[PDB]
Amino acid sequence: SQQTRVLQEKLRKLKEAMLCMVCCEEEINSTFCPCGHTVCCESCAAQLQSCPVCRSRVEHVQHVYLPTH
């Protein structure tokens, strides 16, 4: 129905919010510490020395195990 189409779009938007903001291909699973922005996959996070959201120094990357994975 039309409601199936509406729900597919909502699901797509929620899944896109869970994808890395740099590569757009892999799920977010890494936090830039200490700022806390959790916006990248592990491969993109390993290549950034400054946060892409707030520009703070990345002291280290913490892997996050999320229930939505």
**13: Cβ–Cβ under 8 A, 6 or more apart, which residues?**
none
- Smallest gap from Cβ 38 to its own copies, in A, equals 4
Cα separation, 59 vs 63, in Å, equals 13
Query: Does residue 63 touch its own copies according to CB under 8 A?
Result: yes
Q: How far apart are CA 4 and CA 61, in angstroms?
A: 39
Which of 22, 26, 38, 42: binder of its own copies (CB under 8 A)? Answer: 38
**Contacts to its own copies by CB under 8 A:** 1, 3-4, 7-8, 10-11, 14-15, 17-18, 21, 28, 31, 33-39, 53, 62-68
